[PDB]
Design a protein around this ligand. Structure first.
Ligand SMILES: Nc1nc2c(ncn2[C@@H]2O[C@H](COP(=O)(O)OP(=O)(O)O)[C@@H](O)[C@H]2O)c(=O)[nH]1
Length: 193
């Protein structure tokens, strides 16, 4: 997190992680579209011929102050192509909370398992433990007929039983529950050491 003493703001970064086409862009799009226009900044997409990154920040107009400071949240997706790992590392630097978006399709489970490990390693490179930091997992695409049961997705992707949420991101099911969960964990950490 970054404390700005001029604007009296605690800036926090939340990174949506996961394999290609799992639903990160959709999560951030739905969050942005439902956020009050006076509290959010510009939604910015950085695209190439093969990949993209989406990010924006907002000031939750609910949400009390912490020692006089208001909290600003910056949401980032991560690129999905194998050759942008450096970018992913750069986006994870200084992360405060992480959401892992899992594609519940059986044909993507292996992909999920890869991305998860890629998250772990990357955090471990910067000195942090995925099990110790604010972190929730989202089982997305529950509407699809090839969606894996929650118990098997948990056996594969959430063996230490961190908070998990089921979602159909295009319609908005589970999106704001996930966001609220990871934001609550981040704020609890902010009110401590
Ligand atoms: N049926 C279904 N489709 C989804 C869901 N979430 C995302 N999609 C679709 O999956 C495709 C990839 O989603 P996107 O957010 O762009 O993936 P990203 O690479 O992780 O950002 C898009 O065409 C979405 O419409 C879901 O929960 N259910």
């Amino acid at each position: 997190s970054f404390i700005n003493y001029s604007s009296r703001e605690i800036n926090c970064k939340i990174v949506y992680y996961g394999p290609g086409l799992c639903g990160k862009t959709t999560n951030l799009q739905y969050i942005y579209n439902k956020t009050a226009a006076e509290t959010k900044g510009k939604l910015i997409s950085l695209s190439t011929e093969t990949d993209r990154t989406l990010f924006f920040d907002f000031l939750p107009l609910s949400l009390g102050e912490i020692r006089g400071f208001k909290t600003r949240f910056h949401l980032y997706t991560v690129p999905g192509q194998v050759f942008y790992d450096a970018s992913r590392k750069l986006i994870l630097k200084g992360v405060d909370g992480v959401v892992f978006v899992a594609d519940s399709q059986i044909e993507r489970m292996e992909a999920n398992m890869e991305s998860l490990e890629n998250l772990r390693i990357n955090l471990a490179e910067q000195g942090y433990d995925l099990n110790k930091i604010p972190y929730v997992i989202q089982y997305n695409k529950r509407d699809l007929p090839n969606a894996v049961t929650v118990e098997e997705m948990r056996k594969a992707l959430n063996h230490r039983n961190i908070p998990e949420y089921q979602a159909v991101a295009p319609t908005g099911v589970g999106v704001f529950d996930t966001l609220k969960a990871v934001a609550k964990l981040v704020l609890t950490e902010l009110k401590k050491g």
